[PDB]
Design a protein around this nucleic acid. Sequence first.
DNA 1: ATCGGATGTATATATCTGACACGTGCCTGGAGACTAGGGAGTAATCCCCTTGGCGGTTAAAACGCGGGGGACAGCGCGTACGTGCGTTTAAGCGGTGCTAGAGCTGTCTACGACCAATTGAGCGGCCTCGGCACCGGGATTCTCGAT
DNA 2: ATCGAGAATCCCGGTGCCGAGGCCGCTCAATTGGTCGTAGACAGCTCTAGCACCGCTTAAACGCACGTACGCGCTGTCCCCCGCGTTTTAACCGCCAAGGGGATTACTCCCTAGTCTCCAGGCACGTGTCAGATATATACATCCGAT
Lengths: 93, 94, 99, 99, 82, 83, 85, 109, 108, 148
Amino acid sequence: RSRKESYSIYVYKVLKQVHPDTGISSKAMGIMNSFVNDIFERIAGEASRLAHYNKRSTITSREIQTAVRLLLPGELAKHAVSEGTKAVTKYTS
Amino acid sequence: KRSRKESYSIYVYKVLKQVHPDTGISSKAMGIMNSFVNDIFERIAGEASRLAHYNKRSTITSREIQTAVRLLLPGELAKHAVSEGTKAVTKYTS
Amino acid sequence: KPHRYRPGTVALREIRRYQKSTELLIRKLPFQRLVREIAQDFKTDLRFQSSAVMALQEACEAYLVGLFEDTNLCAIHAKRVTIMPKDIQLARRIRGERA
Amino acid sequence: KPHRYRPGTVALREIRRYQKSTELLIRKLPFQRLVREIAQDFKTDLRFQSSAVMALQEACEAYLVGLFEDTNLCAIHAKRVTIMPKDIQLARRIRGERA
Amino acid sequence: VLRDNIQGITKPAIRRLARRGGVKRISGLIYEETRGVLKVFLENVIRDAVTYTEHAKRKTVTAMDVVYALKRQGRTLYGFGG
Amino acid sequence: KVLRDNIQGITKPAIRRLARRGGVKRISGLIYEETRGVLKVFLENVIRDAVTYTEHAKRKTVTAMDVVYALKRQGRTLYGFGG
Amino acid sequence: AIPSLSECQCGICMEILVEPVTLPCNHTLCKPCFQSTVEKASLCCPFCRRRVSSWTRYHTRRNSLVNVELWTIIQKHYPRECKLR
Amino acid sequence: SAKACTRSSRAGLQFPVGRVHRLLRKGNYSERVGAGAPVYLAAVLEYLTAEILELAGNAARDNKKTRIIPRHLQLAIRNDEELNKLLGRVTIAQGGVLPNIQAVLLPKK
Amino acid sequence: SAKACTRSSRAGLQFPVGRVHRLLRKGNYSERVGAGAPVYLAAVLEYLTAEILELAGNAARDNKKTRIIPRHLQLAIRNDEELNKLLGRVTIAQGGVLPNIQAVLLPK
Amino acid sequence: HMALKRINKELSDLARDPPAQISAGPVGDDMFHWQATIMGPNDSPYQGGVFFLTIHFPTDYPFKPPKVAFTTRIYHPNINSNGSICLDILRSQWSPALTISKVLLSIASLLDDPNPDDPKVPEIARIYKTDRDKYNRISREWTQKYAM
DNA sequence: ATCGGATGTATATATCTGACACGTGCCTGGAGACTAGGGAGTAATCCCCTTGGCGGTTAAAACGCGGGGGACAGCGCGTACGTGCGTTTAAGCGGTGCTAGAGCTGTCTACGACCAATTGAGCGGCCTCGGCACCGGGATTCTCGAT
DNA sequence: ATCGAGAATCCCGGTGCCGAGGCCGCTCAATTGGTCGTAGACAGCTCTAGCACCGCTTAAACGCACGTACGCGCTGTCCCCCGCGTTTTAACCGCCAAGGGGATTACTCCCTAGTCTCCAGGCACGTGTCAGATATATACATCCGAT
Ligand SMILES: [Zn+2]
Ligand SMILES: [Zn+2]
């Protein structure tokens, strides 16, 4: 056997932050892990394509922000952009 | 002078003269042919790279391109393209 | 003397029951045998993991449920409640499967 | 004494004439005005290349042609020859654009 | 300033498209629905086109941006570049 | 150990159950053959890609990951089996 | 008029025509030569050099490659050497 | 920040910044990767996961259970409009379907 | 094949092997690219282009023309089943529509 | 098999009426390796030049073109020191229906006039394109110091 | 407009079982300090083309009328499918046994990345002549009211 | 079943135009040669689980009888798009004029890949335990024939 990676612990921590009482089964863990991987792949691929179009050779924060703006719908885009900007601002200092 | 730009116009013209010795092509169709070539190249290259990454590899050999061609193109086109590419590789190595 | 329902009420009860639950609706062994028979044509002497068959069954059931969901609307559009093969063909043509 | 074609025989002539031709069908300046008025809402004081406007017009025409083909199929399915907004709504719902 | 330009899509301009599509007889309520769906599609394409234009710190909507938006939406276009 | 015409294993009650889940109230008698044909076509299309994936990797047992990849390639992503 | 042995042959191998395939360019040759050329030669007519990959791609699905109208006649009128080869 | 704690905590995030950064760097997306991209991506992922988990928990509480199961996730995703548009083509295993019947099919009064 | 000559002629091809190799290298597709992939890719691309060009040329010659306008390309793509399946979602500029009318609409 | 029969029949065809200013023959018992002597064309700067070439037949024929190499060293736009000829017939559009007589006459024609469209080495091609006189004199010197 | 059977659905209580949540070892990957180089930010500048405007002519849009044909409402037929009961069939669960093959590990050699020199394949700019666009004339070919 | 008048479409012939194919000058990217770190091809071992079988249930499927309700074809009405003629409206072509920002070049700096060393976060593994599925027995919602 070898190490197999997943997002189980982080999803569990987020669930405990949101809903202190409820619990989560294994199939829900698999579904959430697959969804997270899918969204990560989508956003990263769109950001890479956006970087390649502009003849640049790097993926800065603004390209991820524009990819999020392109992918997510109108209502979720504002909240996602606000969360990302807040996280970046808190991290930079 | 304007900066250099790259396109597949001359190669498409050579192929057209190879198949139809006396039939020219318009520029508005040369652009469409160039776009078709670019799109097919992008599709095949992306599929082959994805297939190579799924097997924990770091090299795009002829096998990955061949399997990507088999997955992408329909049946008869896939068979003919595989035969042509295998013949080309065999002729190139020897 | 005996009690029996009018045509249609049992259909509505079955619709409610099946939309309420989530279990699979195709018998496992016949579907596994069909999958093996289809696969043996492409490459002989194959083996199947216990999860690939389940994934195939889930995908097929979801696709069929979606197709019947579209077929119901297609049938209702023509002032009918019964679904017939022309409805399925029209839905497939519109969806782009064979257009 | 005046000569009038029967209702429904000039439509077939128009279909035959237009399916064999390839020019743009919508006027250029009205489409330019519509595109500029739509785009100025998202970000004010924008400039458009002619090629971009032409591409938008031709993509819109192709999309409308496909939608009307599907609408005609839906209308023929319901034992009719006219096309009505419910056919368009049903075609869009099946295609998944609206859902 | 420009407003109420949706009427630029005239009744003959929609009848011609329907005739190309293969429609024999048309009702009278089709035109408004066609205008609405065309407006929706144009807004959907222009949103991505403007996003592409603004990301590059530009001010002109190049046809390449429109082609990329159409390809992203799943309606790849041949002829204007790419 | 050859297998013949196992497509008859998708019996009429299973098709009626699937239609009931899909929201159908009344079913004609000719639906079953069309449903079997559509299911056979879809299975063939998915399994061809699955076999191609498992043959490019030099194996003899198809894994669920190959089925998930084939479904994703065809445009129907599936959660619940890794990825 | 019936064609004789001189006017019915596979010029590629210069051997008696067997299960031929007829190209749209009106050139005829025996099937094994056609198969080996279509997979291994330049994918064109060896006589007039016309691209024929579209034709064979279309006709492979329906198994209409063989020209039975002439193959059956040649086999019927020349049983001897057909039995020999 | 003081750049003394973990990078995930340095941005107020529960998702791993380092793992996302490594995935972007070695995932064959671009020649270079900026220092701010993984934080943004992890924040977006955490926000989306928190939203879906909150909706699933609400659906679970409505059903009187306490353990989230795939049916609850399917209900939460399909009931909301934004996530239904986002996950348009996603098929969820063992998720069921929304309960609905057409108005025509219902019996007359 | 004998060395000491250009790569695009060693395989008997017409598309450029070197340009395809550079695109594969710098397309962010993979860390390393084999020496045989560009030849196979160029052969496949040239085969597809030759197919489309031959069909378009036949369509143009049917119309007593000596040039290939995009309408001929659209006719060639739509008429063939395999190319239509390959390019189902693609829209060709100024390609028009393949003529067809439903049998019901026709007069009786 | 069929390749040997075709070799025998083409040898018979060559024997019954050999082409002018060219004569080919097998090296020995085997038929795969042949040597051919060819006389230079009269309207060429290679007057009185006799040229020896070697041709090798693969296991499959005519479906692969045979490999040709000039034994001597010549100053021609489509030739190198290795003796291989940059002819599209030899590698690109070789056809099974084509006979060795056709390719030999094609090589003779290339000797009569070269092709600068796709030369193997382009330096001497542009040498030919620049001035006819000094190319003619250098070719005459090469063919006098090599063929004779 | 309901009444009462009768059916199925919904609700309250014991129970026991296996999957969920937490403790532990540890090792593999993540964090920290330092270095070097190139990718990107920024300032100047050129000129391509996009916006703005005028004049004309005319092909297309707008408007109104007569009317035939198609949408739609209603009705009667009877045939196909829903509903229920008896019987036959193979799915489903447990239990065990076997080995083909996925999976992990040590070797090292051949394939590919990296870099300097160099020149020819390929691109930008010109140009001219022929294939294509346009107009006039007549023959061809559906079409419809009248027989 | 048709004759024939009137209208739309195709063939043909002549005339002119602009853009596509060939050519020249040139700058930069592909080639060739050589070196070096390493990716995976291969042999070998392990041990997981996929396949095969057997025995016992009882749950789902099959066949058939009966009845009804809905698909379908038919008929009648009205109203609403279609074809046509006339008039108004702005599209389209050609022209002129200006300036804005797209594109390019040059300069410089600091951001991130690359390196090594050190340590702790999460994964594999194990175990206790209660959430929920099940069985069992009542309370109520709802369907159907008929007053
Ligand atoms: Zn032969
Ligand atoms: Zn021929």
